[PDB]
Amino acid sequence: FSTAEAAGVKVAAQDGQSPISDLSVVLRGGSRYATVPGVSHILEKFAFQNTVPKSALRFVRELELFGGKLYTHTTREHIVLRTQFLKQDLPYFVDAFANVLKETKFQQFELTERVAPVAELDLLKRESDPAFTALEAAHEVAFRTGLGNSVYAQGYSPVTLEDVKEFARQVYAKQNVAVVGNNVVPADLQQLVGTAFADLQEGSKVTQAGTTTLHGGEARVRTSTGNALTIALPIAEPKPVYHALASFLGGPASMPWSVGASPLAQATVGTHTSVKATYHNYGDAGLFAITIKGDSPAEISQVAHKAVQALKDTGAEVTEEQAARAYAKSKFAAAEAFENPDSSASVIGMELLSGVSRIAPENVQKFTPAELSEAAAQLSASAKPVVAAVGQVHALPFADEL
Amino acid sequence: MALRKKNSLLNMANSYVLDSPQPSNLNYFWNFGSLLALCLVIQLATGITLAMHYT
Amino acid sequence: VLPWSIGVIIFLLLIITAFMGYVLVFGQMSLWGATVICNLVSAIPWLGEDIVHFLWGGFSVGNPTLQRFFALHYLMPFVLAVFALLHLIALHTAGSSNPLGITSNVDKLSMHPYYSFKDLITVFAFLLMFTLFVFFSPDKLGHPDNYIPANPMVTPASIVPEWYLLPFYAILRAIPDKLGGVIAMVAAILILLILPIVDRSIIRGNAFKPISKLLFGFFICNFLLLGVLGQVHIEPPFIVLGQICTIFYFSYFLILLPMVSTIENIFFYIGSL
Amino acid sequence: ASITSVVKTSELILKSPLLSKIVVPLAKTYVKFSGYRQLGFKMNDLIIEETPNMQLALRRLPPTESYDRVYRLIRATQFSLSHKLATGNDITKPEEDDHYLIPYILDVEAEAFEKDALDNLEVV
Amino acid sequence: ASITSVVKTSELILKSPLLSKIVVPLAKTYVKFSGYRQLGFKMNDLIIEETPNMQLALRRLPPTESYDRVYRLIRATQFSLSHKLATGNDITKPEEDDHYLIPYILDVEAEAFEKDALDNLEVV
Amino acid sequence: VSPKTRTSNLKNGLTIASESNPLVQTATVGVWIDAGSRNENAYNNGTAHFFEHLAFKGTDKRSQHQLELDIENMGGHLNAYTSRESTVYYAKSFKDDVPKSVEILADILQHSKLAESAIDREREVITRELEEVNKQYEEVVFDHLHATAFMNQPLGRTILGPRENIQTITNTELRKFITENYTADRMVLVGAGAVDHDALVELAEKYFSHLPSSQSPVPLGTPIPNFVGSEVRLRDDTMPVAHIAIAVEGVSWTSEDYYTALVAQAIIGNYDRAVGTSRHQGSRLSNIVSENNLANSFQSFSTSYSDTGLWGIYLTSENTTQIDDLVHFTLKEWNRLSTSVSNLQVERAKSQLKAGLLLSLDGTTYVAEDIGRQLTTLGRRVTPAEVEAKLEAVTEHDVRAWAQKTLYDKDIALVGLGPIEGLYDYNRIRNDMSMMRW
Amino acid sequence: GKSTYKIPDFTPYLKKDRNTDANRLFSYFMIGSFGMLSAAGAKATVQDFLSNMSASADVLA
Ligand code: HEM
Ligand code: HEM
Ligand SMILES: CCCCCCCCCCCCO[C@@H]1O[C@H](CO)[C@@H](O[C@H]2O[C@H](CO)[C@@H](O)[C@H](O)[C@H]2O)[C@H](O)[C@H]1O
Ligand SMILES: CCCCCCCCCCCCO[C@@H]1O[C@H](CO)[C@@H](O[C@H]2O[C@H](CO)[C@@H](O)[C@H](O)[C@H]2O)[C@H](O)[C@H]1O
């Protein structure tokens, strides 16, 4: 991805040999910057609504004539708007993004009839998985605001058209926008972005209201629709070793009809439960989480004890074999993330919008057993453990039990 | 929505002769109602015609 | 649109019902009116003469025609009652319109007791008019010739329909061609079916439309003049006047109402800016 | 006729200096003789509403505009049944006769007409 | 007649040795000739249900009994329209002909009849 | 323009097919087999699915645990699936972990233990799978759809097989199945992503050279199905959403009408209320359904097999009093493929498909799946230029002629699950397959 | 008796040539014949019946 600048907008593109191009606008407008709760989700859903040059209807009908597709999502850090189309149709897609950023008519009827109902279905579909809920609850306990803001719009706190219009005035500005083109000729994209995004406001860098503060605690989301438990440990100094540790501890199987050879995978034997360790770097803080879902609260409780033990055991001693297995699983995870268009866009988006250079999968550091055990030791001896229980919460563990 | 259901006049006919939900096991003795309707239509047609010629 | 369209058919059935009932007396106007009105069917190309003989049940209006008119005159009011019920059921989906032309969904009253008691006033006003004709002047609306028994030999001085059919008769006389005249006469009723299309107004009804109100006034008075011209003799200058009134009748639907309703739309918009 | 049609034709007239010079005074007199203001209506309260497009435009009115329209319809209905006219502040003054509904119906119709056009596109 | 009446009279008969000796054998043949078991029905499936009391009793059936009753009605309807009889395990055996509904309807009616009595009480 | 798919053979008749992408760092290698449940009879139905479980249960060298560790150490993962006509076993890895992954796949396919103890253990796991598919409503619907459309025929059988067979599957019949079916002339070794073709051919010569050849080598993708118009109703009033599939007999992979059927399917298209753009789609059915809230979703499909196919639509709806309208409007849109479609709809669908068929292939696994599927169904990978030409050859006359012989007034197979009281009987549904006005 | 994927036996009823044009055409020949006799019967009925309104024998005499 050759990083450049076109009329004040950061543009990164990588040419390829495929008939299919992916163009993504990455906006510094994720939930950690959300002025009011849910606004970044609403702004994402307001993309490709009516603009002054082109109605939402006309856009969708023309997109079907190109056979293009449209993908949008919100993270804690970004809003990502992606289009996938044939290489030759690049100018149309550049101009479409320009119309969205410069000329979106934010109309109240679109909010009530189109945008908010779709936002609500989006969230309900995600929450069908209790593990999603548990990991969201864990971020809320751990960070409170900023990273602790909800990613998604919720019913209890309504977003108004004035909220969304204000946020869009901040976000849709040259300072918060990066263009990422997969299988796009980089010289051609710079020329097109330079003509199309020239009249976009310059604006200012959107910032997180307040510094990231870490907290421990418990969240007990009582649902009737499945059971899950996250054990998170907030990290004040994000370090790349936690990727290796997440992959080492593992949890999912690498093979059909198997349990797996990972410590967390072996913690589920004799139970219909699954487990997944994840590490979330957010630049200035991080979160190391272990999420366990299952149908039995008794089994979840059982696995949760084994999970905390596994982390303590790791803090004691890692073998050389295990450390190499962690390097291999981690390099692989990095590679597939840089391939997947959704995650790819945000990775280069971070490099362009902040200045955090991407770590290429081939350059993923090999951590010695000493370095891994040290990282696990810090987590087992955390002052601020978070536990989010979802489901039959009366039957799930508490932080002080773990 | 289908016109037969949407339009109030059509929907009245629909409710009696088309979508009308019937038991699946009516035997042939449930056919006398339609024969009575047939007799009534024959009597109206023949009766009005005889009225054109009768004094 | 649907209650109005079924309404137009109710009006046609009332005309047929009343025409057949008038023949039943079998006085001079009964016979000669049946003869001339039934001979209009002879204009239907190719089969017209055959259809007339078939309707009469013979070669002129006679006993077979009278007996069949009795049977049909008895039947037609029952058919008319069914169509009257159909147009009410069709109306029930929107409810009654009202004189302001706006929705009444904001402010409804039960039919009873309010409109029950308001209907009694006009029932008694109607019964007073009924009483004055039926008891004090029972033959004012009739033709003396219908007290002479039908005589196929002697033709009455003037053969005219009952007063309520007179405007349609004037329209028919206006066209010199037989078939032309019959088409025009039928079209004068069926053209009511196009009002939903030719009225281009964004507003329902005339309460707030001064130009439409003037046009409506002229249309109604022209309809009454056509009625009068239906019973004058075919003489100057009434021949030409009947043709001008016929043109005005049709031009209301085809030209004037579409033009006036278009212009009034623009005056409401510009006038209230 | 569509509101779109009425609005476009009116704009053609308002552009032409000659045309506006002769049409605008007539339209103002027409409105005065129409007399809907004497029942406390605004012009847009009279537009036929029993149509999918108009029902959608009315649903998009802001709540305040919607509640006030309901009151003007009820008040006009009460003047109509009483055979009275508005007096005083119930009479709509010319400056209060605002086109509150026109922008909503023009947006509803814009989409409706674009949908009709696009249903008839032919790939070239 | 009410189920309560039928049940009480039946109990009077079953008490009397003489009466039961002559009535019970008759009732068993009656049921055999009735032939509802040959369509896979249980006796209680035949009771008229279009009454408030019976609709309430049916709503109080346990879900499994309710689902099985639905199946027996559908199955019997299919035998009826085909002009066939049950065979094999579809025939209701005498030991399967259980009064699953009688306790529910007797409770519904007990309350209904107590309510009628108490609506007519006279303070003494 | 995507890189050329290279293809080589070994002596036994194993095909190697590869498509390199020097921009990615991962690779998907695997074995596509032209064999699946359809190759079983009634007695061993379920064997192919049973084998897929045992393939990961230990080989002559590596035990179950060693297998787990070996893959964990590789860093990527292994995956498998068995369908009615196709079995796949693949490994996603790093660029330089490809020789490990080929070696593990070759081991689990050729040298699996199928130990009586493991057969007995899985026999319970698979028995539990019978009572948990019940939740995956789309799969329940499509399995009943095949069962009824191809009543009492091999395509009509499920992949899991009956409970009775699961209890009686022996290591003998497992071994017999994979010896008869997993032959070199029915197998394709596929690599996509960061793979060298010449490297992959060497690895094939090293690991898959001692594969049996079949006695009578037919070409890849070689097969008579007799469709039954019929219905399965699985009414469940406690479910909130109705799931309905309606299908007619469709087209095989090698039909001359294969592209015509895809274009017709694209004219009806898909719809999902949860996606923002779906209210603005061009499809007539989409407009009717969205305006009237008739459904949560619908998905048109055109499934192909070697000698038949099913073409139809899958609907989901909460609108339980308007299921009749939903079905009525859907079948009236099908009628219009016979009576009304013109160059307007046809050219629009062709535009959308020309991109769609390329867009689908957006990762190494999708590319590998495309090479593997095409090689095992057609015997070759069809270049995008050829695909563009075949799509361009579809005219409106072709669509109307196809719909008139395939849809118009034809029997349907219909499956309804959930609150489907409002779904009318077979005749009233099948009467919507024609229009009396035409 | 338990599996819903095992379709009940329909072999006593199923026709082997059920998907053929000849199969459909036969059933439409029955429907068509019925429609044809109903058309011919309606025509005869209407013509004979309505002829009552044409001049009776005593009128033609
Ligand atoms: C339920 C409907 C009807 C029934 C049961 C019925 C019954 C009868 C009967 C029993 C007769 C004596 C027939 C004879 O022996 O000659 C008769 C005669 C007659 N009916 Fe009806 N009728 C009915 C409807 C009508 C209608 C609607 C008319 C319309 C006028 C009508 C007109 C006549 C006439 C004119 C005669 C005398 C001529 C004759 O005997 O045939 N009938 N009717
Ligand atoms: C037997 C003759 C008729 C009867 C008994 C009849 C009766 C009625 C009644 C009771 C109503 C509701 C109350 C009212 O508005 O006055 C009504 C409404 C109506 N009628 Fe008629 N009607 C007849 C003929 C006609 C004709 C000939 C037409 C049209 C040409 C017609 C068109 C309508 C319409 C459009 C309405 C709805 C008017 C509205 O409320 O805005 N009717 N009719
Ligand atoms: C028999 C000849 C055919 C002509 C029809 C007979 C005329 C009698 C019709 C007028 C009586 C009113 O008839 C009444 O109409 C409504 C809708 O039409 C029916 O209503 C029924 O169907 C509609 C949809 O089909 C549903 O909204 C409703 O839930 C259901 O109850 C009533 O069950 C019926 O009693
Ligand atoms: C909307 C429908 C269209 C209009 C309906 C037409 C109404 C009248 C049509 C013809 C009626 C008379 O037409 C005539 O019918 C009678 C049968 O009834 C036929 O007469 C034939 O059969 C009758 C008895 O069945 C014999 O007595 C006669 O000798 C023989 O010729 C004539 O051959 C035919 O010329």
Residue numbers in the entry:
A (entry chain B): 15 to 416
B (entry chain C): 1 to 55
C (entry chain N): 111 to 383
D (entry chain R), E (entry chain G): 2 to 125
F (entry chain A): 26 to 248, 260 to 474
G (entry chain E): 39 to 99
Task: List sentences quoted exactly from the publication behind this structure.
(iv) +FCN: oxidized with potassium ferricyanide. The [2Fe–2S] cluster can thus be positioned close to the Qo site (referred to here as the b or proximal position), which is formed by cyt b. In all the other tested conditions with the high-potential chain partially reduced, oxidized or reduced by DQH2, the Rieske domain was more distal, beyond hydrogen-bonding distance to cyt b, and the hinge formed an α-helix. Consistent with previous EPR experiments, the Rieske domain was found in a position closer to cyt b when the high-potential chain was reduced by sodium ascorbate compared with when it was fully or partially oxidized. In the absence of quinols, the reduced Rieske domain interacted more closely with cytochrome b and cytochrome c 1 than in the oxidized state.
